[model samples]
Target: SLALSLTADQMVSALLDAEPPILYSEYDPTRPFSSMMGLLTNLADRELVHMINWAKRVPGFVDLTSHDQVHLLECAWLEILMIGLVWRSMEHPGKLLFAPNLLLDRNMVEIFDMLLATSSRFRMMNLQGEEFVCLKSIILLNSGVYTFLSSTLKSLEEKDHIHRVLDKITDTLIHLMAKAGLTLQQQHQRLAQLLLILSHIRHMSNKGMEHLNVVPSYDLLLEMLDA
Candidate 1:
């Protein structure tokens, strides 16, 4: 009943905003590194909860095997974070907007360049919020236990459901791009470009972790990251 009443975009907006953002600006740098780590640790925990809740809101995600569900979330979390960051930064470039007063910084700022470039491309392509939702869904469901989770026959049903959902959302993305007046080749290119952003983020994530690890004061913060 609710699905019929609301578009995917509407559902996604509510899901995306379900969790309060990490207002790093409010954090006092003068505080001990342990305190800063505590703040980051809380933010990381909240983000994991938010990701889980958002996944459940995706149609059919909760219906999947619980095992498969966690697997996909593990595989998709970084992509989801990057997508959210890109969306927040689209209207304003150079700064990574975690909130009105907050700006995401440090090694995280490294990807902001790619993020802004990706955001510009999406805007130039005239991407819709609905398509953005589909893109997010696609990231969540992509590879469909195709990689991790040690998926087996026990998880087949759920994995199949992921594949099905991924296909459906992809079709939605194609249709949305078409609506934006993209030719078939151009549409294919757009999808490729989106994937390229994901690939770049993967590289950035590794470097980010390394950067975090090297910060002696970030010991506790790195622990949260591993968690």
Candidate 2:
């Protein structure tokens, strides 16, 4: 019933509308390393809040138990953000446009190499905006796979419900591709490429978590990371 009510266009528009506002990072070459990292981490915390709001607006997302919602966000927030980061930076080639005003050269951080590589891969694929939103949703819905927080039958039921929601989203993604005039074979190939990128995103997200764990994060970010 939820899927029946939610059209592909509605889902795509909801995601596009919920995107976080552009954040300006205050990194400067003259700034101390600690200060630069502090500014970046703070920006990340702000973005995390926005991501939570976006998750709520995702179709069928609120139908899950509140506990499941919390767990899913905890597990997948970084991956979702990474997807956004890659999409945004894809146009910058060798540099990572961490924010509209925060373009980062590879020398600034060792991690920039990996980030740029992923960005380049996305650019090479000519990833579309609609595909980006769908990919983010897929990463979020698939978060349950990384967690084992429940053992009861109720939890099983919740997983099943989430599975249906994912199917609905996937259907919408395919529909969007079809509407864009991709032939059946092209759609299949594109879907596979998008799904394959998930693994790369996951690997990068894990690396991001490892780096963030040592940084001085506070409040919600600290709680989410520790969760």
Candidate 3:
């Protein structure tokens, strides 16, 4: 498989190259609530555009059927965004680096407690950039709803293909872990811990949508969330 043929470093580089440049939020603490939300939503809309471009560049993503591609992205965009958010904030305890210049005090937003906690966990685990990239791939690739599809046979085939792609990405993640000199037992524990974070991301996704509902998000961000 193409995914298996690429070295872990190559895979990491591909993902890194596809990453969006740092964006700054214009959120002001002194601004009115609606004004602050507008700024945040604008930033989120920009992030969504970058995320779509990033997804297209992800190994094996373009190989999926167009329908499957759209479905997977729509289902998991929030979770994917959450992973990026957590990674960006990993170095800054008690704060969320929403953007390079937008450091938000975590305590100020009660709705984001889960996000803050997830970031703290990622920090404690000492998640590396390679691991973060692999995790994002897994989150996107592993998301879907085959049972809801009208064509059961086609859905099954698509599901199997996605699983194989996920396997390749998982292998890359494991290779990266071993290269870091972690013992087999340590790798197993670490992998388990990393996979466990997906549940938290999913929960955060749901909570995040609820939070978004209260704010007025425009166009792309609104459409993606509503879809």
- Tell me the alpha-carbon RMSD of every candidate: 6.4, 3.7, 4.0
For candidate 1, what is the TM-score? 0.68
- Model 1, residue 142: displacement in angstroms? 2.0
Q: Against the unseen true structure, what C-alpha lDDT does each candidate score?
A: 0.60, 0.76, 0.77
Candidate 3: residue 141 lDDT (0-100): 85
Please identify model 2 stretches exceeding 4 Å from their true place: 1-4, 26-34, 108-110, 212-227
What digit string (tens of lDDT, one per residue) describes model 2 on residues 89-123? 98888887768867777763545677788888898
1-227, model 3: which lDDT tens digit per residue?
A: 47656777788888778877767787666966465567667887788777877888888777766667777877788798778888999998888787876778844265477888999999899989888888998888886544336566877777877888787777787888899999999888898899999988988887777764533233443454335
> How high is each candidate's TM-score?
0.68, 0.86, 0.85
- When 1 and 2 are scored with lDDT, the better candidate is 2
User: Worst lDDT window (10 residues) for model 3?
Assistant: 213-222
- Number of the top candidate by TM-score? 2
Better of 2 and 3 by TM-score: 2
- The residue-level lDDT of candidate 1 at 178 comes to 79
